Amino acid sequence: ERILVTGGAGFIGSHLVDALLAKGYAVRVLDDLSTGKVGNLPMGDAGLELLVGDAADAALLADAVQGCDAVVHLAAVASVQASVEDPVATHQSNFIATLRLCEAMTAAGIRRVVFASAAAVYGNNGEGTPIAEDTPKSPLTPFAADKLASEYYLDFYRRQHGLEPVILRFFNIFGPRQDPSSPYSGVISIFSERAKAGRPITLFGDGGQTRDFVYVADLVKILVQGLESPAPAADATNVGLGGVTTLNDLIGALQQISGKPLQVSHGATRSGDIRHSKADNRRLRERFDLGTPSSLAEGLERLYRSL
Amino acid sequence: AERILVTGGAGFIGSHLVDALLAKGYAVRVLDDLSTGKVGNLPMGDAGLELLVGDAADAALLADAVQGCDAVVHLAAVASVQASVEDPVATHQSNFIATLRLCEAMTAAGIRRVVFASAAAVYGNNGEGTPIAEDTPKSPLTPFAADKLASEYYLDFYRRQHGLEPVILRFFNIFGPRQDPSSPYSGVISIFSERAKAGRPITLFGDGGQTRDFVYVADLVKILVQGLESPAPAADATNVGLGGVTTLNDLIGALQQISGKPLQVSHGATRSGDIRHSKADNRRLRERFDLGTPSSLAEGLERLYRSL
Ligand SMILES: NC(=O)c1ccc[n+]([C@@H]2O[C@H](COP(=O)([O-])OP(=O)(O)OC[C@H]3O[C@@H](n4cnc5c(N)ncnc54)[C@H](O)[C@@H]3O)[C@@H](O)[C@H]2O)c1
Ligand SMILES: NC(=O)c1ccc[n+]([C@@H]2O[C@H](COP(=O)([O-])OP(=O)(O)OC[C@H]3O[C@@H](n4cnc5c(N)ncnc54)[C@H](O)[C@@H]3O)[C@@H](O)[C@H]2O)c1
Numbered sequence: 042e043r044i045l046v047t048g049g050a051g052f053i054g055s056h057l058v059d060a061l062l063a064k065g066y067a068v069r070v071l072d073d074l075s076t077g078k079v080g081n082l083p084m085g086d087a088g089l090e091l092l093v094g095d096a097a098d099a100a101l102l103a104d105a106v107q108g109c110d111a112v113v114h115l116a117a118v119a120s121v122q123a124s125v126e127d128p129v130a131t132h133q134s135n136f137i138a139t140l141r142l143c144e145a146m147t148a149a150g151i152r153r154v155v156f157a158s159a160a161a162v163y164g165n166n167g168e169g170t171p172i173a174e175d176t177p178k179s180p181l182t183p184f185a186a187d188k189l190a191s192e193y194y195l196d197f198y199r200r201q202h203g204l205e206p207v208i209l210r211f212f213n214i215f216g217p218r219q220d221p222s223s224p225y226s227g228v229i230s231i232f233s234e235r236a237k238a239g240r241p242i243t244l245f246g247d248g249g250q251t252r253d254f255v256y257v258a259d260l261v262k263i264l265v266q267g268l269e270s271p272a273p274a275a276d277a278t279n280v281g282l283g284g285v286t287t288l289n290d291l292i293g294a295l296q297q298i299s300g301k302p303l304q305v306s307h308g309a310t311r312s313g314d315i316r317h318s319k320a321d322n323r324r325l326r327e328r329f330d331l332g333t334p335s336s337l338a339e340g341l342e343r344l345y346r347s348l
Numbered sequence: 349a350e351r352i353l354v355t356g357g358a359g360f361i362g363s364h365l366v367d368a369l370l371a372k373g374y375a376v377r378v379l380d381d382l383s384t385g386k387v388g389n390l391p392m393g394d395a396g397l398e399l400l401v402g403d404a405a406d407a408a409l410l411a412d413a414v415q416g417c418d419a420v421v422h423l424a425a426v427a428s429v430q431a432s433v434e435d436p437v438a439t440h441q442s443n444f445i446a447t448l449r450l451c452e453a454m455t456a457a458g459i460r461r462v463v464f465a466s467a468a469a470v471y472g473n474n475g476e477g478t479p480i481a482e483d484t485p486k487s488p489l490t491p492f493a494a495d496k497l498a499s500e501y502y503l504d505f506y507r508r509q510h511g512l513e514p515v516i517l518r519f520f521n522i523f524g525p526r527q528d529p530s531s532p533y534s535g536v537i538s539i540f541s542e543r544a545k546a547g548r549p550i551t552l553f554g555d556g557g558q559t560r561d562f563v564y565v566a567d568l569v570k571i572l573v574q575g576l577e578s579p580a581p582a583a584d585a586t587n588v589g590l591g592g593v594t595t596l597n598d599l600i601g602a603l604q605q606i607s608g609k610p611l612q613v614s615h616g617a618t619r620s621g622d623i624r625h626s627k628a629d630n631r632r633l634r635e636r637f638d639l640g641t642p643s644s645l646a647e648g649l650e651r652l653y654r655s656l
């Protein structure tokens with residue numbers, strides 16, 4: 042059995058690639074290496090096949106899909122801010138690739154696709170509340186609108202052409218191989234890289250902001266279950282733990298792990314920042330086997346010891 | 349004299365809007381690919397009218413078309429939902445990419461005001477059988493409906509990020525002269541009226557108890573012009589329905605009586621996707637626009653019938 046993983050050379054995708062190969066799958070990666078890196082992949086694993094190109098390219102997707110039993114669709118420009126700066130270009134990666142994938146899967150008779158949607162589809166709705174999947178949508182950026190549009194098209198292909206989409210709205214994923222080089226990189230990747238290097242961090246605001254952080258290995262387990270479940274539900278599932286971690290908690294946790302004090306410069310609160318973000322993960326608990334997820338401290342330590 | 353760009357200006361709603369803007373003294377530039385639009389719909393001969401034949405998703409064309417324009421009405425789209433079910437890839441260019449490319453061209457040119465033809469389709473089946481308020485949860489079921497809603501989201505992004513002034517209008521069921529009846533999925537009033545004028549049978553799909561919130565095109569045109577001229581239009585969407593209730597059976601009787609001739613009604617099965625009850629909550633419309641006295645169904649059907 043062969044799994045196509047678009048965006049398989051990236052942060053989440055490469056961890057998924059490792060897990061699928063360890064389970065005995067043949068794995069085909071489609072990645073344009075815009076942010077993905079070949080160093081993330083087990084090149085030389087005989088079960089792994091790398092295709093380099095644009096997931097929005099119809100002819101290449103027809104090749105990439107042939108001989109595949111299922112698909113995990115992770116390819117997108119992950120930076121929300123890149124979509125603000127270039128709506129036209131990012132719309133190709135963040136929506137057209139989904140549409141093209143629907144067409145290629147339908148023509149080839151492949152049903153199961155696991156899709157990386159995003160908590161950004163909610164906008165600021167549900168600030169301060171456990172965010173359920175029926176929370177009203179308010180996508181504020183091209184990236185968020187394209188993720189939600191991808192959801193709606195995937196649902197149309199389900200009803201009209203028999204597709205089996207597994208729609209997952211990721212909350213704040215973290216772990217090894219997450220790039221900390223951009224200012225808008227995940228806060229954990231940035232704080233961890235600075236703490237390892239003994240360099241100061243900048244806290245934007247008072248640090249009371251809370252996020253529902255998910256360690257990448259726990260998300261990977263969900264992704265694999267999405268591929269293997271017999272009859273997945275038709276509607277979206279939040280991927281969060283319902284956890285509440287303040288940034289000040291995160292700073293203290295890293296300081297304890299690094300064994301050295303973290304110098305904390307004070308920045309203003311980011312414009313448009315959501316203060317309190319937490320998933321209601323009832324659907325996740327009901328539809329998937331969550332086992333015992335990594336605690337924040339366990340995830341931070343696995344990340345920090347990998348740097 | 350100010351100039352209004354009207355994408356889709358050669359179509360059913362667009363050409364009536366063009367007539368109205370010209371009568372008010374505006375200059376008008378139409379951008380239309382003549383896919384379903386028609387040059388015969390336009391007063392080719394009004395000195396204030398310019399016609400550009402081309403694709404509204406064409407960025408080079410839009411960069412030319414916005415030059416010297418003071419505001420826009422964005423009506424271009426493949427109107428038929430069924431066409432988007434058959435060809436999602438092609439219709440996405442017309443139903444969403446055209447909006448995105450217009451936002452880019454308007455921002456570069458400094459033009460703020462754009463009136464956008466959204467659609468009741470963004471609600472799907474949510475709120476069926478109730479007056480649908482604009483904050484009803486969305487459920488676009490086809491590529492057309494998803495593309496109209498995505499257009500709303502991008503328009504709101506360009507508002508907050510680049511100072512665009514979108515007037516988002518969710519049309520319910522618009523009818524009137526020039527609505528093309530040549531498709532089996534043309535609007536039911538354009539189809540029924542064409543058959544009645546010809547003395548030929550109509551086909552009723554279902555029991556005829558389905559209800560729609562019909563709007564005569566001249567009343568929508570009044571709203572479109574006000575959207576162009578309002579000082580500080582609201583950022584959120586406004587339904588364009590009257591909150592009225594017309595069954596298909598109401599329409600059959602009303603049209604038969606207007607025609608003065610017998611009307612044969614053949615049967616067909618309910619269409620698989622068919623929503624039975626569709627009505628707008630009109631409160632935001634009544635707050636934000638001056639509706640005056642809208643045309644009743646009978647007055648609209650009569651004006652339609654008298655034109656053929
Ligand atoms: N990390 C998070 O917290 C988070 C949150 C919500 C959603 N997501 C979604 O999860 C998925 C994985 O993101 P990630 O965190 O691993 O970031 P990432 O940038 O490491 O992974 C994105 C991958 O997609 C590839 N890619 C981008 N555009 C492409 C294109 N046009 N064609 C082919 N490949 C292309 C990139 O090269 C990269 O390998 C993305 O869709 C992202 O939007 C992530
Ligand atoms: N009941 C209704 O009439 C109704 C309901 C909801 C929404 N709308 C929206 O109102 C607008 C007008 O629809 P209409 O009823 O007048 O039908 P219409 O087909 O007569 O008008 C659509 C026009 O857009 C033009 N067009 C299509 N694709 C184009 C492209 N790629 N580039 C340039 N021009 C293009 C067509 O040539 C036509 O003139 C559309 O956006 C439609 O989706 C209409």
Ligand SMILES: CC(=O)N[C@H]1[C@@H](OP(=O)(O)OP(=O)(O)OC[C@H]2O[C@@H](n3ccc(=O)[nH]c3=O)[C@H](O)[C@@H]2O)O[C@H](CO)[C@@H](O)[C@@H]1O
Nearest residue numbers: 429430469533534535536537539551552553558619621622
């Ligand atoms: C013209 C138009 O925009 N139609 C769309 C509109 O349908 P919508 O149902 O709103 O409008 P229509 O004018 O197409 O049809 C109204 C009713 O009349 C019926 N009828 C129609 C034709 C006929 O010859 N006999 C008859 O009885 C239809 O089945 C329907 O029940 O929203 C639906 C949901 O997005 C789309 O699927 C339709 O394509």
